Design a protein around this ligand. Sequence first.
Ligand SMILES: Cc1cc2nc3c(=O)[nH]c(=O)nc-3n(C[C@H](O)[C@H](O)[C@H](O)COP(=O)(O)OP(=O)(O)OC[C@H]3O[C@@H](n4cnc5c(N)ncnc54)[C@H](O)[C@@H]3O)c2cc1C
Ligand SMILES: Cc1cc2nc3c(=O)[nH]c(=O)nc-3n(C[C@H](O)[C@H](O)[C@H](O)COP(=O)(O)OP(=O)(O)OC[C@H]3O[C@@H](n4cnc5c(N)ncnc54)[C@H](O)[C@@H]3O)c2cc1C
Lengths: 592, 592
Amino acid sequence: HMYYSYGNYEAFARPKKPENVENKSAYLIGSGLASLAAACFLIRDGQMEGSKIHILEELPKAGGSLDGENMPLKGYVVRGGREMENHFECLWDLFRSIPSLEIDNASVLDEFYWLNKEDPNYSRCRVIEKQGQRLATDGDFTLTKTAIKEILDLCLTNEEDLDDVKITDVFSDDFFNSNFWIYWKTMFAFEPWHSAMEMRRYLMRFVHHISGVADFSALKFTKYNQYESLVLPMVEYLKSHGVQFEYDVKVEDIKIDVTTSQKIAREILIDRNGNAESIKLTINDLVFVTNGSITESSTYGDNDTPAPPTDELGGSWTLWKNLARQSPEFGNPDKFCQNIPKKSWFVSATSTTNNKEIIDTIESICKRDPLAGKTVTGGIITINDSAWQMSFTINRQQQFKDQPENEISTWIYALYSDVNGDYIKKPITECSGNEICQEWLYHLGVSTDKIEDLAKHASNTIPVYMPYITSYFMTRAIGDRPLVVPHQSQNLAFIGNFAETERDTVFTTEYSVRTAMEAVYQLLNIDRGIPEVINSPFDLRVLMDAIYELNDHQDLREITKDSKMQKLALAGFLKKIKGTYIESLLKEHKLL
Amino acid sequence: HMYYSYGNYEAFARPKKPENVENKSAYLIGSGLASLAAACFLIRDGQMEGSKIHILEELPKAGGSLDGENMPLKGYVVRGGREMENHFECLWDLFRSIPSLEIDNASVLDEFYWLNKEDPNYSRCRVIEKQGQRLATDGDFTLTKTAIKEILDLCLTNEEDLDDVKITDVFSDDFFNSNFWIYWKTMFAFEPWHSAMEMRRYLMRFVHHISGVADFSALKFTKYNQYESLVLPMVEYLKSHGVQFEYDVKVEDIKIDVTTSQKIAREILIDRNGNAESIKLTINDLVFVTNGSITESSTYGDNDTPAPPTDELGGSWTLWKNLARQSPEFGNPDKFCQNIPKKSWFVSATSTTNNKEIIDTIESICKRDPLAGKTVTGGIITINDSAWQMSFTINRQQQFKDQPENEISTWIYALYSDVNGDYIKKPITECSGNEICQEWLYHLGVSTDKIEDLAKHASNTIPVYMPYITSYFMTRAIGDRPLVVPHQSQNLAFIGNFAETERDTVFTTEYSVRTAMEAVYQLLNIDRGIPEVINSPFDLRVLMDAIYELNDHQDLREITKDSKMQKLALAGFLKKIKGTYIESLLKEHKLL
Ligand SMILES: Cc1cc2nc3c(=O)[nH]c(=O)nc-3n(C[C@H](O)[C@H](O)[C@H](O)COP(=O)(O)OP(=O)(O)OC[C@H]3O[C@@H](n4cnc5c(N)ncnc54)[C@H](O)[C@@H]3O)c2cc1C
Ligand SMILES: Cc1cc2nc3c(=O)[nH]c(=O)nc-3n(C[C@H](O)[C@H](O)[C@H](O)COP(=O)(O)OP(=O)(O)OC[C@H]3O[C@@H](n4cnc5c(N)ncnc54)[C@H](O)[C@@H]3O)c2cc1C
């Protein structure tokens, strides 16, 4: 009930009012980015009455995983950071229509575009080691021929043949020893046991940005945290259109008839203010389920208390489990929320400080004044030789509108959770905020004498334990994620980064916007094209650049210089294409 | 002073106000589509004051080659028809901002998009012969292996090696005997002696539409003629912004200093109301020259008088000639406006009638009621065995808002001008309107008894002799067309279908919009990306579809079934790619 498109024609075109939409209502389980984007699309393109749009949230506030607040009895905390790129096609379709809350007569897209042109993002230091020294080979990928061939063979493998395959199953030691693996696994938070299918999707989806993977030149960021820059403008727009925010309501089940001909949502069983109630649904009441959550059951610590580890299934995962009992076409949540290894990423941390010594130590590494208000680290700095495999970033300060001008807040995360640290020789899951800050300051090169004092009394570090933060990337098979609109579904859609759609990559905001938009368009039969995932993996020019970049800026003669079986094929093919447009294209892209 | 881009990010983004634009003015030579589009871009993105924008036109009305009027003392006349496609990226960037004059709160793009979704364009009869019989092989391309190989070898030839090369120089008899050549040469008005470079550009530019070349399923049309649907909305927008239309002013020269460091336009020498005057220019007065015109020196006939042939250089060609004397970087107009062969297309015709016999004869061929207001012929019908190589179309009737509801107007053109017709055994350039109508009705299958009466007294046919209508496609070399902004030019730009820009194809409205937009962006340093020409020739999927379609829907096994040198290579390559994503892609596109 939809079609994919690309180009300006379908981008600038407005859809006609969908049929019978004046007699339809919408209920969105959750208030993360997916549900908010779907509500926005229901307003703009579906032309649905705002009062007929119900957003059900269990927390006190909207946003979801794009949070960012001065949590009372703690401090400033951002559960993550949002790297963004130009080719978030659906997200930019969305946010060009959302008024910015910072610039008059300007969209969120306008503010973002002008900002990332004023202060472009780039890293002057990406990988450090030995307590604050930049990696000597920072910039190069250092991939052997076997590692490059393994990358290509992963891309050349059909997705259908990658069910439950792990990343270590399709890569050997040269790849894991390469700088490429450092950059890739830290900027995308991949683990060695994660889904090779999703890694292949990532390789094909961002292949146009390989030249900017090491220096983060392809990344783009908002001014503030994603709650103030993305969530609040969207919420203001939706409220100005009368959208119905219902807070502190927990959905436990959705009664759905799965017949031989239809799948129809009949009832929303909810818990509002401790009272178990029911929402009866007709065929004209669409339900958008954000199945699963990476932030569910998050616990919080403080400067002197670790965030208590948990294995608790919340409302999101129990709701997906309850929906899976009604049809296998609704997915298998256990593949994502169970058997998460102990080593997996769990803990994030936000360390706030105004101390000049820490800020100056950061300036000495990132080469930029962290209080200047512009780019600081340009993205995560990775401590290569850290036992926790730790990375940290400082975005444009301050990430909060009402943060003091002399403060900075640093986001820290670790890929390995069950390993003794190098300074604090305990696993990160047993560390308070100041202890994470201590282990972090140790790798900055701070003198061991000052580390403990500067961490405990000069910094306020809030830690966060998310038991499902790596859940997106767990090894999966085709069918474990429900289709955005399952077969014969009449009024039920699955959105968010656990739904199934082609080619696009999860753990991205664009995936949420895409699933929201596809769900709305399919359920309402909106007569407008959906922007396909950008066609970079099919672009000959982009693939030529990929070959040039993966081989550390070498032409075809240098790549094949160490084998006769390579040299002969290259010479024959070159004579075959001599003096043609193919040769000119290869020369234009530095491959000849 | 510009960059190319693609995707929604740069499409929806607005540019900041360009620097120092409040102290700048603009003068546009001509009022065709290029000048109007450039004025629109100066208003919207350059944010230039409308009163500082001067559009100089020598004719009484604006529009140029997009005309369409009830010419007094004659009849209805459209000098041509405008086939359009979805991937006119720059044009759709433009017209999404131009308010439609037919639908409230809707752009021209909105009206066009909704209309071509309501009444999609497709032909139920494309090629006829033997006085009104549909070609038996209508639909198939009927290309031999040699013809397909010649097409690919033209595409694989560097553009730089195609200077002054003719189409007959890179094609043999199989290609010219193919139905592909019929469709291609008639829908694009290519002649055998025309530029092979431009034919290669056409092959690469519309390769995504090969599946819809025979039935015109990829074409899209406005509601009315291009003067009422495109020109009038643009003019209304520009006037609502205070743009300065100066009519009946003929530019004869532009005094330009071409120094070792700069090219600066100093003076506009004009003839306004018979008075020779001068317009002094500073560096902040940009000049946009529409160098050359395909409609210049057009003569008109009537039902009983031929359009008098002419070789006269008008104001456009003499102005381009005068500019060429000042620098070779400004092009060589003589390559386009001299040595036009006698055989070339010169004559168009608009035959209007309300006679039921002619309309019913048309319904019997095109299978649609020509007075229904929807699609009629879906594009040009080509009379294959006509000596004039004649084609004709009937767009959605009526093409004029104030045309009687019982009338239709048919556009007719002929590729060969110096050949005796099959019924009227004179060349078309010696035929009155009714005589062209007679030769046309003869190929419809009208009984010879009624042809002459129905043409002379039941129809009103206006003919038009354009000595330069084929000028776009004349054999050219790199440098014969000036760059949109020549090197070191400070305030001079060349727009229209005789300027030079990469990859895009001339004889298209999109080329005019593209040159206008690139000129404005380069001269004003507008901080927004220009949409590149659509990347279809670099898209692996599109190229696979091209292979499948050119070979008349055959997979790789059928294509290679008649040679061992083909079979062996195919079998080896297939075993090399067996069970991979390459094999799956080839199967998805029906090549395996
Ligand atoms: C650490 C981290 C790093 C990130 N990095 C990036 C990055 O680099 N790039 C990028 O593009 N994006 C990034 N993201 C964003 C990521 O894509 C998020 O998933 C994004 O916010 C999408 O939100 P969502 O609505 O799809 O899911 P969520 O934000 O998880 O939505 C869940 C919401 O639904 C509510 N909910 C769940 N179940 C119920 C129920 N039964 N009843 C009521 N309410 C319920 C929850 O309370 C919550 O508000 C990151 C996120 C995190 C947490
Ligand atoms: C027969 C025909 C078929 C076509 N088919 C198609 C098609 O299939 N698809 C498509 O996309 N487009 C088509 N077109 C449109 C084509 O691309 C036109 O060139 C288009 O209108 C672009 O206009 P332009 O402003 O670039 O050139 P023009 O329209 O030629 O602009 C010239 C204008 O400038 C004026 N002028 C010139 N010199 C001077 C001077 N010295 N002083 C003052 N005024 C001057 C002229 O009077 C005229 O108004 C067709 C056009 C014709 C005529």
